[PDB]
Amino acid sequence: AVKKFKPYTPSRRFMTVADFSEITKTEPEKSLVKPLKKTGGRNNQGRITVRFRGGGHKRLYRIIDFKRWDKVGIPAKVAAIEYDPNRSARIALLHYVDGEKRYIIAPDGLQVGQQVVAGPDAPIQVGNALPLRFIPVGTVVHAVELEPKKGAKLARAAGTSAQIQGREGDYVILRLPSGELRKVHGECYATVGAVGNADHKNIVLGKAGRSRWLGRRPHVRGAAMNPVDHPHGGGEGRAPRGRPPASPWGWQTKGLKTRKRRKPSSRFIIARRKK
Amino acid sequence: MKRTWQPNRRKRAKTHGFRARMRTPGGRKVLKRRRQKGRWRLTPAVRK
RNA sequence: GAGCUAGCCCUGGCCAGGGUGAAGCUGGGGUGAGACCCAGUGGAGGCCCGAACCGGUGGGGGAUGCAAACCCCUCGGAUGA
RNA sequence: GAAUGCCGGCAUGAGUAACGAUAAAGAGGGUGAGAAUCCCUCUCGCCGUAAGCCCAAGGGUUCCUACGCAAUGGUCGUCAGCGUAGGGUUAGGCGGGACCUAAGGUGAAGCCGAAAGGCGUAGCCGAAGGGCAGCCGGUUAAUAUUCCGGCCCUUCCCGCAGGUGCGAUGGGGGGACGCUCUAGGCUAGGGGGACCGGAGCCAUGGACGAGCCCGGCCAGAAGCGCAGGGUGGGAGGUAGGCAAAUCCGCCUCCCAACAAGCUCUGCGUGGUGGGGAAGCCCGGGUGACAACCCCCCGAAGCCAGGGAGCCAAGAAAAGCCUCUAAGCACAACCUGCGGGAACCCGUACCGCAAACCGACACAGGUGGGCGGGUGCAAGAGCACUCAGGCGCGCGGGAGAACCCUCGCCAAGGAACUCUGCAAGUUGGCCCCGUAACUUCGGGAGAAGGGGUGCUCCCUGGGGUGAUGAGCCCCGGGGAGCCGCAGUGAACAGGCUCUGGCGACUGUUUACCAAAAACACAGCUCUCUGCGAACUCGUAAGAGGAGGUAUAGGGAGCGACGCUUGCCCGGUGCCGGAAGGUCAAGGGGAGGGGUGCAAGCCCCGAACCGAAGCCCCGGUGAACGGCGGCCGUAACUAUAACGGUCCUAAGGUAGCGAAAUUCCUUGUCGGGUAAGUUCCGACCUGCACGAAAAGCGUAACGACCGGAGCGCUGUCUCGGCGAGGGACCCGGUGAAAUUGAACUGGCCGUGAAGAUGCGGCCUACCCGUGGCAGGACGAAAAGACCCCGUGGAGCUUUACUGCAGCC
RNA sequence: CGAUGUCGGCUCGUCGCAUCCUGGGGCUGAAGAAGGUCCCAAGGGUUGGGCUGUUCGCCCAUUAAAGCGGCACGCGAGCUG
RNA sequence: UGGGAGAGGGUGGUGGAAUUCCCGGAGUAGCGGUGAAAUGCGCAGAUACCGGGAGGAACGCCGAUGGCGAAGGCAGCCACCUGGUCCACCCGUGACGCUGAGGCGCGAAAGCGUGGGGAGCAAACCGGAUUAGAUACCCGGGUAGUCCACGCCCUAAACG
RNA sequence: CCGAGGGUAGGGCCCGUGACUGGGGCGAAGUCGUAACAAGGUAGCUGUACCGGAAGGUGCGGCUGGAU
Ligand SMILES: [Mg+2]
Ligand SMILES: [Mg+2]
Ligand SMILES: [Mg+2]
Ligand SMILES: [Mg+2]
Ligand SMILES: [Mg+2]
Ligand SMILES: [Mg+2]
Ligand SMILES: [Mg+2]
Ligand SMILES: [Mg+2]
Ligand SMILES: [Mg+2]
Ligand SMILES: [Mg+2]
Ligand SMILES: [Mg+2]
Ligand SMILES: [Mg+2]
Ligand SMILES: [Mg+2]
Ligand SMILES: [Mg+2]
Ligand SMILES: [Mg+2]
Ligand SMILES: [Mg+2]
Ligand SMILES: [Mg+2]
Ligand SMILES: [Mg+2]
Ligand SMILES: [Mg+2]
Ligand SMILES: [Mg+2]
Ligand SMILES: [Mg+2]
Ligand SMILES: [Mg+2]
Ligand SMILES: [Mg+2]
Ligand SMILES: [Mg+2]
Ligand SMILES: [Mg+2]
Ligand SMILES: [Mg+2]
Ligand SMILES: [Mg+2]
Ligand SMILES: [Mg+2]
Ligand SMILES: [Mg+2]
Ligand SMILES: [Mg+2]
Ligand SMILES: [Mg+2]
Ligand SMILES: [Mg+2]
Ligand SMILES: [Mg+2]
Ligand SMILES: [Mg+2]
Ligand SMILES: [Mg+2]
Ligand SMILES: [Mg+2]
Ligand SMILES: [Mg+2]
Ligand SMILES: [Mg+2]
Ligand SMILES: [Mg+2]
Ligand SMILES: [Mg+2]
Ligand SMILES: [Mg+2]
Ligand SMILES: [Mg+2]
Ligand SMILES: [Mg+2]
Ligand SMILES: [Mg+2]
Ligand SMILES: [Mg+2]
Ligand SMILES: [Mg+2]
Ligand SMILES: [Mg+2]
Ligand SMILES: [Mg+2]
Ligand SMILES: [Mg+2]
Ligand SMILES: [Mg+2]
Ligand SMILES: [Mg+2]
Ligand SMILES: [Mg+2]
Ligand SMILES: [Mg+2]
Ligand SMILES: [Mg+2]
Ligand SMILES: [Mg+2]
Ligand SMILES: [Mg+2]
Ligand SMILES: [Mg+2]
Ligand SMILES: [Mg+2]
Ligand SMILES: [Mg+2]
Ligand SMILES: [Mg+2]
Ligand SMILES: [Mg+2]
Ligand SMILES: [Mg+2]
Ligand SMILES: [Mg+2]
Ligand SMILES: [Mg+2]
Ligand SMILES: [Mg+2]
Ligand SMILES: [Mg+2]
Ligand SMILES: [Mg+2]
Ligand SMILES: [Mg+2]
Ligand SMILES: [Mg+2]
Ligand SMILES: [Mg+2]
Ligand SMILES: [Mg+2]
Ligand SMILES: [Mg+2]
Ligand SMILES: [Mg+2]
Ligand SMILES: [Mg+2]
Ligand SMILES: [Mg+2]
Ligand SMILES: [Mg+2]
Ligand SMILES: [Mg+2]
Ligand SMILES: [Mg+2]
Ligand SMILES: [Mg+2]
Ligand SMILES: [Mg+2]
Ligand SMILES: [Mg+2]
Ligand SMILES: [Mg+2]
Ligand SMILES: [Mg+2]
Ligand SMILES: [Mg+2]
Ligand SMILES: [Mg+2]
Ligand SMILES: [Mg+2]
Ligand SMILES: [Mg+2]
Ligand SMILES: [Mg+2]
Ligand SMILES: [Mg+2]
Ligand SMILES: [Mg+2]
Ligand SMILES: [Mg+2]
Ligand SMILES: [Mg+2]
Ligand SMILES: [Mg+2]
Ligand SMILES: [Mg+2]
Ligand SMILES: [Mg+2]
Ligand SMILES: [Mg+2]
Ligand SMILES: [Mg+2]
Ligand SMILES: [Mg+2]
Ligand SMILES: [Mg+2]
Ligand SMILES: [Mg+2]
Ligand SMILES: [Mg+2]
Ligand SMILES: [Mg+2]
Ligand SMILES: [Mg+2]
Ligand SMILES: [Mg+2]
Ligand SMILES: [Mg+2]
Ligand SMILES: [Mg+2]
Ligand SMILES: [Mg+2]
Ligand SMILES: [Mg+2]
Ligand SMILES: [Mg+2]
Ligand SMILES: [Mg+2]
Ligand SMILES: [Mg+2]
Ligand SMILES: [Mg+2]
Ligand SMILES: [Mg+2]
Ligand SMILES: [Mg+2]
Ligand SMILES: [Mg+2]
Ligand SMILES: [Mg+2]
Ligand SMILES: [Mg+2]
Ligand SMILES: [Mg+2]
Ligand SMILES: [Mg+2]
Ligand SMILES: [Mg+2]
Ligand SMILES: [Mg+2]
Ligand SMILES: [Mg+2]
Ligand SMILES: [Mg+2]
Ligand SMILES: [Mg+2]
Ligand SMILES: [Mg+2]
Ligand SMILES: [Mg+2]
Ligand SMILES: [Mg+2]
Ligand SMILES: [Mg+2]
Ligand SMILES: [Mg+2]
Ligand SMILES: [Mg+2]
Ligand SMILES: [Mg+2]
Ligand SMILES: [Mg+2]
Ligand SMILES: [Mg+2]
Ligand SMILES: [Mg+2]
Ligand SMILES: [Mg+2]
Ligand SMILES: [Mg+2]
Ligand SMILES: [Mg+2]
Ligand SMILES: [Mg+2]
Ligand SMILES: [Mg+2]
Ligand SMILES: [Mg+2]
Ligand SMILES: [Mg+2]
Ligand SMILES: [Mg+2]
Ligand SMILES: [Mg+2]
Ligand SMILES: [Mg+2]
Ligand SMILES: [Mg+2]
Ligand SMILES: [Mg+2]
Ligand SMILES: [Mg+2]
Ligand SMILES: [Mg+2]
Ligand SMILES: [Mg+2]
Ligand SMILES: [Mg+2]
Ligand SMILES: [Mg+2]
Ligand SMILES: [Mg+2]
Ligand SMILES: [Mg+2]
Ligand SMILES: [Mg+2]
Ligand SMILES: [Mg+2]
Ligand SMILES: [Mg+2]
Ligand SMILES: [Mg+2]
Ligand SMILES: [Mg+2]
Ligand SMILES: [Mg+2]
Ligand SMILES: [Mg+2]
Ligand SMILES: [Mg+2]
Ligand SMILES: [Mg+2]
Ligand SMILES: [Mg+2]
Ligand SMILES: [Mg+2]
Ligand SMILES: [Mg+2]
Ligand SMILES: [Mg+2]
Ligand SMILES: [Mg+2]
Ligand SMILES: [Mg+2]
Ligand SMILES: [Mg+2]
Ligand SMILES: [Mg+2]
Ligand SMILES: [Mg+2]
Ligand SMILES: [Mg+2]
Ligand SMILES: [Mg+2]
Ligand SMILES: [Mg+2]
Ligand SMILES: [Mg+2]
Ligand SMILES: [Mg+2]
Ligand SMILES: [Mg+2]
Ligand SMILES: [Mg+2]
Ligand SMILES: [Mg+2]
Ligand SMILES: [Mg+2]
Ligand SMILES: [Mg+2]
Ligand SMILES: [Mg+2]
Ligand SMILES: [Mg+2]
Ligand SMILES: [Mg+2]
Ligand SMILES: [Mg+2]
Ligand SMILES: [Mg+2]
Ligand SMILES: [Mg+2]
Ligand SMILES: [Mg+2]
Ligand SMILES: [Mg+2]
Ligand SMILES: [Mg+2]
Ligand SMILES: [Mg+2]
Ligand SMILES: [Mg+2]
Ligand SMILES: [Mg+2]
Ligand SMILES: [Mg+2]
Ligand SMILES: [Mg+2]
Ligand SMILES: [Mg+2]
Ligand SMILES: [Mg+2]
Ligand SMILES: [Mg+2]
Ligand SMILES: [Mg+2]
Ligand SMILES: [Mg+2]
Ligand SMILES: [Mg+2]
Ligand SMILES: [Mg+2]
Ligand SMILES: [Mg+2]
Ligand SMILES: [Mg+2]
Ligand SMILES: [Mg+2]
Ligand SMILES: [Mg+2]
Ligand SMILES: [Mg+2]
Ligand SMILES: [Mg+2]
Ligand SMILES: [Mg+2]
Ligand SMILES: [Mg+2]
Ligand SMILES: [Mg+2]
Ligand SMILES: [Mg+2]
Ligand SMILES: [Mg+2]
Ligand SMILES: [Mg+2]
Ligand SMILES: [Mg+2]
Ligand SMILES: [Mg+2]
Ligand SMILES: [Mg+2]
Ligand SMILES: [Mg+2]
Ligand SMILES: [Mg+2]
Ligand SMILES: [Mg+2]
Ligand SMILES: [Mg+2]
Ligand SMILES: [Mg+2]
Ligand SMILES: [Mg+2]
Ligand SMILES: [Mg+2]
Ligand SMILES: [Mg+2]
Ligand SMILES: [Mg+2]
Ligand SMILES: [Mg+2]
Ligand SMILES: [Mg+2]
Ligand SMILES: [Mg+2]
Ligand SMILES: [Mg+2]
Ligand SMILES: [Mg+2]
Ligand SMILES: [Mg+2]
Ligand SMILES: [Mg+2]
Ligand SMILES: [Mg+2]
Ligand SMILES: [Mg+2]
Ligand SMILES: [Mg+2]
Ligand SMILES: [Mg+2]
Ligand SMILES: [Mg+2]
Ligand SMILES: [Mg+2]
Ligand SMILES: [Mg+2]
Ligand SMILES: [Mg+2]
Ligand SMILES: [Mg+2]
Ligand SMILES: [Mg+2]
Ligand SMILES: [Mg+2]
Ligand SMILES: [Mg+2]
Ligand SMILES: [Mg+2]
Ligand SMILES: [Mg+2]
Ligand SMILES: [Mg+2]
Ligand SMILES: [Mg+2]
Ligand SMILES: [Mg+2]
Ligand SMILES: [Mg+2]
Ligand SMILES: [Mg+2]
Ligand SMILES: [Mg+2]
Ligand SMILES: [Mg+2]
Ligand SMILES: [Mg+2]
Ligand SMILES: [Mg+2]
Ligand SMILES: [Mg+2]
Ligand SMILES: [Mg+2]
Ligand SMILES: [Mg+2]
Ligand SMILES: [Mg+2]
Ligand SMILES: [Mg+2]
Ligand SMILES: [Mg+2]
Ligand SMILES: [Mg+2]
Ligand SMILES: [Mg+2]
Ligand SMILES: [Mg+2]
């Protein structure tokens, strides 16, 4: 559930906050944090290349194990579930019987005290990771690699998951979070279960200040600007779009498809997203 | 009110100083010109 | 040329005093268990009043100025974007 | 001789404005050629969360002393931040460097670019962050944590003694962290003392007093005491920490666990060294063998890496410790002690300002620390005042108009005016009390009202003590006294009813607009499967993101409530393996030039041949659009109904003379004596209408309307008073402007508005304070307007290109 | 057009007279009182308020009357805005 | 105490038929629909047939005039948790009872909020017919919704 | 001291009245269509939802107080 507030300020009337119930530990493992170099949306030339970024709360980056096949057969105990400011999902601290310690992102239903393990021979249980070819058709899965040994890329945000839909040759067929149907190589690793913190999307920010804490600076409409600034600029008084709705750079932004047509991964994408 | 000159010696030397000028094509031409004209000071003098 | 100004980045600093009294917690009541109600405790908030500090609402003065934007009175924010 | 020409010089305005905060001066003595202005003394005033003190920047000798006064100083000058000269800045411990890293910058390897150059993990550089050893007093004209004195301390080298598997740029621990709130115990700082020390005083009616006045501390190793921070111990196993590891991590077993222990810091004490007032006397002496004690208040500072709660989840690296590798184990390291060694730069002075930024000794701007006392509920607010610092570098008179800032006003009380603009009123605290409506928080300090000083008596609880006295905090009850008045001075909301717009706190046109504009949570459309889309770049490379569709980009709408209709013909976008059109290229029927020829060369039809366009369809919270005429009902009027032309389809709900209504001050109702505004209605909506959203909405607003109560010099209608100017005298002394001028009125004339022409009238010569009708007064080669085959910003289904993409 | 500042208000007037009032007259469909209409007459006078930026106008309460014009639609080196 | 029947309820899992869509094959001139038609779909290859896949909803036969529940209502199969009820024994308690204003709880469908899901169906809506007209009945489309969770709504020819 | 009451201010309840507006009843000599009663010409009624000049329609679920 999400936590609500009594309307004792105009903003607490709508503000909702996560309950943080799953979190058992409030400090990150010191050996697994490193400083995150805040960018402000600026590239190496010093230029804004993503608008309206910066000024958010300071964060340390928790190193996440998106490989997992690094330690096949070596089981680990779920020591803690922690807050991670760098992702919507929560993280889980693993204590391997190796003595090694790592973070994975927390599946839904994971239990502090539980054992997890990775490998072809892993049981089909929440928190375990296996190559896709050894996971039964129909089971929902997360932290999915897109190519072998390149790292988990798919189904990583809070509440997300992919479902195994069948097998074809060296490839399994997944329904991705987006509804897309895609072939992924069978040697790609995945973690059974869905990502936790599914309530994430029911959060109501509540005020402008909260967006600013996240590093989101105010977004100013193209219609509020001048012709030098934006296609939608100008007009005396307010103005409708007066042309097909465009980005600051002139390209149309109501329907225009933008995926590159000759892209090689088209050979592996069966059905474009839904909705 | 607060005016435009807010002197700062590190800023002066790091911006207009001799090593700054030497680092860059335009900066070296500045020096060449200033020497060709006979300037007594090639670069702003800063206490340091 | 970003020693003015705009934004961001790193690292420091500052915000008298007073007011309001959220959740939680404990007790009591309540019930099959609850919801919930009350009291105490508690100390939340782009909360309130108001200096510093940041402003620049209205009026008056100034107008070869004290000043190429100032002065007086009044007024906005003052734990927060 | 003219170019609002250029350079220079010198005039006019003119002895005029001004002399830079209205904090304020007076006298006496001295010095000197000269004194309102310099020095000295007494009196007066101003600052005191500063207008005092300390630090950082910036400035760069402005510091100290002597001798000067041409210029500088808004007057003066004997003085000075000015002229000349001499002197003055002392560090192992303060700051920076011989230490570390942050953003960033640079950059071996490596990548990219016509050149110049652009990137780039490591490394390096980079601080006001981390790290690191000095406190108190004294001394100079001028420096002092630097010199001196006392008491402490750090590192390097070397040697001795003891101890240990020693050893690192490698592994590990640690360093290492937010915001808000906050415990205990301390210190800084403060207040009181009938106690301790002290020169003296007894006035002018009283007091020789438990009188007045002054002061009553500072630093300090070891040790000890108090308060806190930090940390479990042993064994066994071990596959992880990119070699090794006995370290760290993980697993198990046993003692210990909110203890102690070990360790570290703070505070107290502490050998010792210091300081030491008023007053008086000429910075110094004396006071003085100074005393140096008790109680209370008490930090935001310290113990500290303390505690709790919360979500937005809060640097790095070295120093340090530990582990081991080569090695080396007569070494090496650790601990104690001792001797030696210990470099470079800064240090003066100003520092909220006359020494910095503003051309000025400029009412402006400038980061950190200290910032006493009393009273007002608190406080850094306000009044006064300590320490300390100042009276603002022109004065002296006068007592007009007028101006500024300020005080008061009979009767009236918004009649002022675009508007109560302005100014009154209200005003802190305690108590009583408080409406619609509401999202149940609020609205709310609603409104409105009562109390407020002093004296005496009684009494309740708390803090420190000890449980008591003392002190200090929070109270309660009774009886009285005084004044016009008790937050007696200063600081401190006027209130309400009702519309519009925007939900709200915020943001903005630096220097004419703060708003209804922007932003905002939230809603929807849409793109994006990750080497994402998108953005910057020629590229490499970056951002996006060390993120992964509960995510990221673009667009509109803008809390919330109830909702968001019809039109897909045009444009856009999406889908469509048919077909049409389609470039290079392929193909080569046929034709041509030339040659004696083989041959060389040229043109070229059918056919094959992509995107795009055409074509088929979908799509509105995509661009956008959302009718007209005639007829018809028991009176009239109107038309539920019917007919008909057109269209892609003819505006739904809701709202409506509106931030939209031309006619318009529509009509009607309300408010007013009177209402072009306002509120409520109606609907012939010139020309509302549903995310350029429609209609509502509690709360909010230095937004813009309308009304009322309170109160007022806003006004009837003006009067008086205050100070700073204006005026006069002494000192200093501008300005724009200026064809030259010996520069009146009228009625005329004149390029059509005459001091200057005609006629007439008026008029002795020259100034001072005043007022603004004229000199088509000054200022700025009109912004409007037009013209120029003048410019620039912007737009697009103008033209033609280019990037980008296909 | 190398600049002749603009509506309205406030303030300050001054003039014209085609006279709103007061004075003097003739005609009357002038009984009186009250009017109508023309003539002479510019000496003085010619109110306060609601609406609206307004001039104007409408309205309220009065009045002897609530005049119309000119003066760069008088007057911004006089004010307002 | 010992037994019984049952779509009584809640949670989780799971099975087959059918519709739709998508992919592959095969194949051609229509399919569909009605009282009859037209809109629509179809040579851009539909319908009819075969194979593969995805997905939601409802459970044929058994099934009945049946069963269960206080009512609303409950129907594939399995497991778990759980209510009511009947019978036989006549063992225990000793009138512990009946009803019940207020209260509390449950309460079909539609509807509402937040989020999922979306095959079929289907208000609104669009088109075709019918008809004097046809904002209907019939036909081709079609969005909420119908389904899941949680929170509301509290109505009925909630009837015997 | 209490005190009739008067005054300031703020609440509650009732009645009368109001531009305009909502539907209701009656009138009937009108206009429109014909929803219900027969299988009433789409069986009806129904709670609710959306919609249409109007009766009413349709969806979802329910009742028979439904003809054959
Ligand atoms: Mg949860
Ligand atoms: Mg809330
Ligand atoms: Mg709360
Ligand atoms: Mg709540
Ligand atoms: Mg509120
Ligand atoms: Mg609110
Ligand atoms: Mg929470
Ligand atoms: Mg959680
Ligand atoms: Mg680290
Ligand atoms: Mg990072
Ligand atoms: Mg860079
Ligand atoms: Mg750069
Ligand atoms: Mg650059
Ligand atoms: Mg940005
Ligand atoms: Mg997290
Ligand atoms: Mg969350
Ligand atoms: Mg949200
Ligand atoms: Mg954040
Ligand atoms: Mg946003
Ligand atoms: Mg915006
Ligand atoms: Mg604009
Ligand atoms: Mg630009
Ligand atoms: Mg452009
Ligand atoms: Mg443009
Ligand atoms: Mg536009
Ligand atoms: Mg426009
Ligand atoms: Mg515009
Ligand atoms: Mg605009
Ligand atoms: Mg417009
Ligand atoms: Mg606009
Ligand atoms: Mg706008
Ligand atoms: Mg538009
Ligand atoms: Mg437009
Ligand atoms: Mg347009
Ligand atoms: Mg593009
Ligand atoms: Mg791939
Ligand atoms: Mg300058
Ligand atoms: Mg500065
Ligand atoms: Mg300077
Ligand atoms: Mg500097
Ligand atoms: Mg510096
Ligand atoms: Mg600098
Ligand atoms: Mg340099
Ligand atoms: Mg020079
Ligand atoms: Mg020289
Ligand atoms: Mg130079
Ligand atoms: Mg910082
Ligand atoms: Mg503050
Ligand atoms: Mg309380
Ligand atoms: Mg709690
Ligand atoms: Mg606040
Ligand atoms: Mg406040
Ligand atoms: Mg600022
Ligand atoms: Mg102002
Ligand atoms: Mg004012
Ligand atoms: Mg004033
Ligand atoms: Mg002025
Ligand atoms: Mg000022
Ligand atoms: Mg002021
Ligand atoms: Mg104020
Ligand atoms: Mg305030
Ligand atoms: Mg405050
Ligand atoms: Mg606050
Ligand atoms: Mg704030
Ligand atoms: Mg902040
Ligand atoms: Mg000439
Ligand atoms: Mg000239
Ligand atoms: Mg000139
Ligand atoms: Mg000249
Ligand atoms: Mg010249
Ligand atoms: Mg002359
Ligand atoms: Mg004179
Ligand atoms: Mg003069
Ligand atoms: Mg003198
Ligand atoms: Mg003199
Ligand atoms: Mg003196
Ligand atoms: Mg004073
Ligand atoms: Mg003080
Ligand atoms: Mg200087
Ligand atoms: Mg000195
Ligand atoms: Mg001189
Ligand atoms: Mg002189
Ligand atoms: Mg002289
Ligand atoms: Mg001078
Ligand atoms: Mg001067
Ligand atoms: Mg002399
Ligand atoms: Mg001087
Ligand atoms: Mg000397
Ligand atoms: Mg020393
Ligand atoms: Mg050295
Ligand atoms: Mg360095
Ligand atoms: Mg440093
Ligand atoms: Mg140091
Ligand atoms: Mg010391
Ligand atoms: Mg010295
Ligand atoms: Mg950290
Ligand atoms: Mg730090
Ligand atoms: Mg904060
Ligand atoms: Mg001390
Ligand atoms: Mg005190
Ligand atoms: Mg005596
Ligand atoms: Mg202690
Ligand atoms: Mg090991
Ligand atoms: Mg002494
Ligand atoms: Mg002595
Ligand atoms: Mg003695
Ligand atoms: Mg504090
Ligand atoms: Mg969070
Ligand atoms: Mg942390
Ligand atoms: Mg680093
Ligand atoms: Mg060896
Ligand atoms: Mg050792
Ligand atoms: Mg050296
Ligand atoms: Mg030196
Ligand atoms: Mg010094
Ligand atoms: Mg000075
Ligand atoms: Mg200042
Ligand atoms: Mg001065
Ligand atoms: Mg100054
Ligand atoms: Mg002090
Ligand atoms: Mg006070
Ligand atoms: Mg006070
Ligand atoms: Mg104050
Ligand atoms: Mg004092
Ligand atoms: Mg003075
Ligand atoms: Mg002066
Ligand atoms: Mg005089
Ligand atoms: Mg003053
Ligand atoms: Mg008066
Ligand atoms: Mg009044
Ligand atoms: Mg009155
Ligand atoms: Mg007003
Ligand atoms: Mg006051
Ligand atoms: Mg009320
Ligand atoms: Mg309430
Ligand atoms: Mg009050
Ligand atoms: Mg109110
Ligand atoms: Mg008294
Ligand atoms: Mg008084
Ligand atoms: Mg004052
Ligand atoms: Mg106030
Ligand atoms: Mg007022
Ligand atoms: Mg009100
Ligand atoms: Mg509005
Ligand atoms: Mg606003
Ligand atoms: Mg706004
Ligand atoms: Mg709103
Ligand atoms: Mg809003
Ligand atoms: Mg707002
Ligand atoms: Mg604020
Ligand atoms: Mg401007
Ligand atoms: Mg401005
Ligand atoms: Mg400007
Ligand atoms: Mg400007
Ligand atoms: Mg202004
Ligand atoms: Mg503005
Ligand atoms: Mg404002
Ligand atoms: Mg704006
Ligand atoms: Mg906005
Ligand atoms: Mg919304
Ligand atoms: Mg972008
Ligand atoms: Mg580009
Ligand atoms: Mg890159
Ligand atoms: Mg990044
Ligand atoms: Mg990246
Ligand atoms: Mg990155
Ligand atoms: Mg991402
Ligand atoms: Mg906006
Ligand atoms: Mg409402
Ligand atoms: Mg319609
Ligand atoms: Mg269309
Ligand atoms: Mg279209
Ligand atoms: Mg169509
Ligand atoms: Mg178009
Ligand atoms: Mg074909
Ligand atoms: Mg041929
Ligand atoms: Mg829509
Ligand atoms: Mg159109
Ligand atoms: Mg549109
Ligand atoms: Mg219309
Ligand atoms: Mg209307
Ligand atoms: Mg309106
Ligand atoms: Mg508007
Ligand atoms: Mg309109
Ligand atoms: Mg018009
Ligand atoms: Mg109108
Ligand atoms: Mg009009
Ligand atoms: Mg009217
Ligand atoms: Mg008005
Ligand atoms: Mg108005
Ligand atoms: Mg009308
Ligand atoms: Mg727009
Ligand atoms: Mg609009
Ligand atoms: Mg506001
Ligand atoms: Mg405002
Ligand atoms: Mg006056
Ligand atoms: Mg007076
Ligand atoms: Mg006076
Ligand atoms: Mg005076
Ligand atoms: Mg005076
Ligand atoms: Mg005289
Ligand atoms: Mg002459
Ligand atoms: Mg003339
Ligand atoms: Mg003339
Ligand atoms: Mg003349
Ligand atoms: Mg002449
Ligand atoms: Mg002449
Ligand atoms: Mg002549
Ligand atoms: Mg003449
Ligand atoms: Mg004359
Ligand atoms: Mg004049
Ligand atoms: Mg003139
Ligand atoms: Mg003249
Ligand atoms: Mg003039
Ligand atoms: Mg003139
Ligand atoms: Mg020119
Ligand atoms: Mg011109
Ligand atoms: Mg011009
Ligand atoms: Mg010009
Ligand atoms: Mg202009
Ligand atoms: Mg023109
Ligand atoms: Mg032309
Ligand atoms: Mg021409
Ligand atoms: Mg151009
Ligand atoms: Mg002109
Ligand atoms: Mg001129
Ligand atoms: Mg001119
Ligand atoms: Mg008669
Ligand atoms: Mg006559
Ligand atoms: Mg006559
Ligand atoms: Mg007259
Ligand atoms: Mg006259
Ligand atoms: Mg008027
Ligand atoms: Mg008018
Ligand atoms: Mg009228
Ligand atoms: Mg009369
Ligand atoms: Mg006139
Ligand atoms: Mg005219
Ligand atoms: Mg005119
Ligand atoms: Mg005029
Ligand atoms: Mg006039
Ligand atoms: Mg005028
Ligand atoms: Mg003016
Ligand atoms: Mg005017
Ligand atoms: Mg003038
Ligand atoms: Mg004038
Ligand atoms: Mg005005
Ligand atoms: Mg104006
Ligand atoms: Mg059956
Ligand atoms: Mg039955
Ligand atoms: Mg028995
Ligand atoms: Mg129900
Ligand atoms: Mg339902
Ligand atoms: Mg429903
Ligand atoms: Mg019809
Ligand atoms: Mg709907
Ligand atoms: Mg819905
Ligand atoms: Mg039944
Ligand atoms: Mg009475
Ligand atoms: Mg019928
Ligand atoms: Mg029928
Ligand atoms: Mg309707
Ligand atoms: Mg109709
Ligand atoms: Mg229908
Ligand atoms: Mg039933």
Numbering used by the authors:
A (entry chain 1D): 2 to 276
B (entry chain 17): 1 to 48
Quote what the paper states about this structure.
Many of currently used antibiotics inhibit protein synthesis in pathogenic microorganisms by targeting their 70S ribosomes, which are complex macromolecular machines responsible for this process. The catalytic peptidyl transferase center (PTC) located at the heart of the large ribosomal subunit (50S in bacteria) polymerizes amino acids into polypeptides in the order specified by the nucleotide sequences of the translated mRNAs. Newly-made proteins emerge from the ribosome through the nascent peptide exit tunnel (NPET) that spans the body of the large ribosomal subunit beginning at the PTC and ending on the opposite side of the large ribosomal subunit facing the cytoplasm. Here, we discover that well-known ribosomal antibiotics, hygromycin A (HygA) and macrolides, which target peptidyl transferase center and peptide exit tunnel, respectively, can act cooperatively against susceptible and drug-resistant bacteria.
To this end, we co-crystallized wild-type (WT) 70S ribosomes from the Gram-negative bacterium Thermus thermophilus (Tth) with HygA and one of the three macrolides (ERY, azithromycin (AZI), or TEL) and determined their structures at 2.5–2.6 Å resolution. In this experiment, we used Tth 70S ribosomes complexed with E. coli protein Y (PY) as a tool to obtain structures of higher resolution. The obtained electron density maps revealed all three drug pairs bound to their previously known binding sites on the 70S ribosome. Consistent with the previous structure, HygA binds in the A-site cleft of the PTC on the large ribosomal subunit with its aromatic ring sandwiched between nucleotides A2451 and C2452 of the 23S rRNA, and is oriented such that the aminocyclitol group protrudes toward nucleotide C2573, while the fucofuranose ring extends into the ribosome exit tunnel. Most importantly, the presence of a neighboring macrolide (either ERY, AZI, or TEL) does not affect the binding position of HygA, in which it interferes with the full accommodation of the amino acid moiety of an incoming aminoacyl-tRNA (aa-tRNA) into the ribosomal A site, resulting in inhibition of peptide bond formation. In all three structures of macrolides in combination with HygA, the desosamine moiety of a macrolide forms two hydrogen bonds (H-bonds), which were suggested to be crucial for macrolide binding: one between the hydroxyl group of the desosamine and the N1 atom of the nucleotide A2058, and the second one between the dimethylamino group of desosamine sugar and the N6 atom of A2058 via a water molecule that is also coordinated by the phosphate of G2505. Unlike their natural predecessor erythromycin (ERY), the semi-synthetic ketolides carry a keto-group instead of a cladinose sugar and an extended alkyl-aryl side chain that stacks upon A752-U2609 base-pair of the 23S rRNA and contributes to the increased affinity and slow dissociation from the bacterial ribosome.
